[PDB]
């Protein structure tokens, strides 16, 4: 009979928003994000059914833009390496895989440094780097370390994030048990290829998710339950050298002997995880098989991961066939698949040995089954833990009908 408006109506609607950083107490180099750790307010909702779709999520793109902006902002004060296109002189090294590095000498208006074979173009003697002209090389400042530091994500006023506590829940479909929280948990993202490394785990049995599961171009990610102990070793010593062009922080030579970086992984844990995922890969009927990547260039057919500021490229083709794994180390890299920009990434002195685990896997369906790994997209890696988070906008200006005299 009459129109009445009610304030504080608990209703929401999907809309875009701008979040902000959050982290625990301290003292990926931070120094820009706020390290606020308030009291975690966890409120559980009942009789609420809200659909979730992490494939069309917007906070993933927001965090993508934020991390790339922070990376470009931190990389800006570092010195450049653009006038280093002077002709090198690479002879040879200084008991297998001893031809992967050759120390070369540069003019720089004479000093020499140790370089890898794959880090220089085979200009057929005289040699040159992978990209000197038309692609600038920007080194990283050694004053800060880009180690994975746990952070949190919180929404401002008028926005909230819905958390799903249901373990047996994929990316799509409705969510029965949903909870509203102001900030996320202590997520520790890490860049990797064909693996997830550090990250949140999942309970119950194995779980799989995808966008369509029919198209072969779409990637399929599997979240593991039992963590696989993966640590690896780097059996090398190396040295430190500074050449004035501008300090040019790099390795000078080798003390002792040259031995390629390589390690072993647990066999029982790998076999158990492989059988556990194979138990469900036959679902959703045809036989299944494991085959390596199709091919292409580097960092897409082999496992790629970082270990305390040092990139490691390990050959994991034998793991997805039929445990030692040969690994190759390189300093030059092209982060974010950028063209025209490069990262020098100097090494560190002494041997390095980090400790990590396994919380996920990357699978790509083959057309024409033979589930091969690959993809090379970090979006799925970051979305492996953001599946239980979805921002939303609240509009408490509800209207209800009643007879007001």
């Amino acid at each position, epitope marked *: 009979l009459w129109v009445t408006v009610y304030y504080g109506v608990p209703v929401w609607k999907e809309a875009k928003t701008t979040l902000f950083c959050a982290s625990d107490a301290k003292a990926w180099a931070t120094h820009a994000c706020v390290p606020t750790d308030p009291n975690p307010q966890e409120m559980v909702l009942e009789n609420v059914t809200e659909n979730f779709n992490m494939w069309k999520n917007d906070m993933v*793109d927001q965090m993508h833009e934020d991390i790339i902006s922070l990376w470009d902002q931190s990389l800006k004060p570092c010195v450049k390496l653009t006038p280093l296109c002077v002709t090198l002189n690479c002879t040879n090294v200084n008991n297998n895989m001893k031809e992967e590095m050759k120390n070369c000498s540069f003019n720089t208006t004479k000093e020499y440094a140790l370089f890898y074979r794959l880090d220089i173009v085979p200009l057929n003697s005289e040699y040159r780097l992978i990209n000197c002209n038309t692609s600038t090389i920007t080194q990283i400042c050694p004053k800060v370390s880009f180690d994975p530091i746990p952070i949190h994500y919180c929404a401002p006023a008028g926005y909230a994030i819905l958390k799903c506590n249901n373990k047996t829940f994929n990316g799509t479909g409705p969510c029965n048990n949903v909870s509203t929280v102001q900030c996320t948990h202590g997520i520790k993202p890490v860049v990797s290829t064909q693996l997830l490394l550090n990250g949140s785990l999942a309970e119950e049995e194995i779980i799989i998710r995808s966008e369509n599961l029919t198209d072969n171009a779409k990637t399929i990610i599997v979240h593991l339950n039992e963590s696989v102990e993966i640590n690896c070793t780097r059996p090398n010593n190396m040295t430190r050298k500074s050449i004035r062009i501008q300090t040019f922080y790099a390795l000078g030579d080798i003390i002792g002997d040259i031995r390629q970086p390589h390690c072993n992984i647990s066999e029982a844990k790998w076999n158990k995880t492989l059988q556990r995922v194979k138990k469900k890969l036959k679902e959703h009927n045809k036989t299944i098989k494991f085959a390596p990547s199709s091919g*292409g260039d580097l960092e897409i057919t082999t496992h790629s991961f970082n270990c305390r500021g040092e990139f490691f490229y390990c050959n994991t083709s034998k793991l997805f066939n039929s445990i030692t794994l040969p690994c190759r180390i390189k300093q030059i890299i092209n982060m974010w698949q950028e*063209v025209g920009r490069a990262m020098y990434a100097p090494p560190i002195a002494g041997n390095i040995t980090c400790k990590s685990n396994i919380t996920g896997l990357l699978l790509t369906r083959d057309g024409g089954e033979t589930f091969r790994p690959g993809g090379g997209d970090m979006r799925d890696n970051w979305r492996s833990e953001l599946y239980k988070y979805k921002v939303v906008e609240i509009k408490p200006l509800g209207i209800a009908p009643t007879k007001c005299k």
Partner: antibody
Amino acid sequence: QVQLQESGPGVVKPSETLSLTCAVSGDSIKSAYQYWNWIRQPRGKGPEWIGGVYSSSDSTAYNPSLESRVSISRDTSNNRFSLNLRSVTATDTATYFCARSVRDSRGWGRYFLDTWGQGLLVTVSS
Amino acid sequence: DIQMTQSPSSLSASVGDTVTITCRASQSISTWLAWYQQKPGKAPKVLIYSASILQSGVPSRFRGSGSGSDFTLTIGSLQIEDFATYFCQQYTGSPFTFGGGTKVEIK
């Protein structure tokens, strides 16, 4: 389905600062991994590359023979990206295109064009 | 600089025949090559990328193969809508040089 639209002057005299813009409909400038490439197709031979701009890092790259004359600029609002060219002379002529490239899943760093525009004939005369 | 060349300039065939286009590169670039179809007027469209993966929406009468520096693309059936100019473009870093350009003729 993403569509590309470009607009600009028809007759442009040489020895000035040329400016062209391209409107993007449907897809956003941010996206995931895309490059807003700017290319030309001179009549007589194949096309040529001028430069491209990243979607998020707003980084850039130019041709090895067109330095200090091309400055690609983009903005978040209006869903469009522009192009600035200096010293047009009698070389920078014919139609211009504002295509988009998507990354390849077979390799790392590969980028190929898949969606193009319509073409804007840039005539140079006295 | 990474130079790109295309040979021959043009050929002559009939409808339903096989057309072979070869592109030679300056150095080995593995399989980092793409093909483009440019019809008379408007803007061209991509044909085959990565030298072996087809495009979603192109007919099955086009097949490409090759590795290293020598590449050759064949056409199973030449239709009325396939009469256009073929261009091969490499994308092994900047710059993104195009091919010389080929054309077909009908007697």
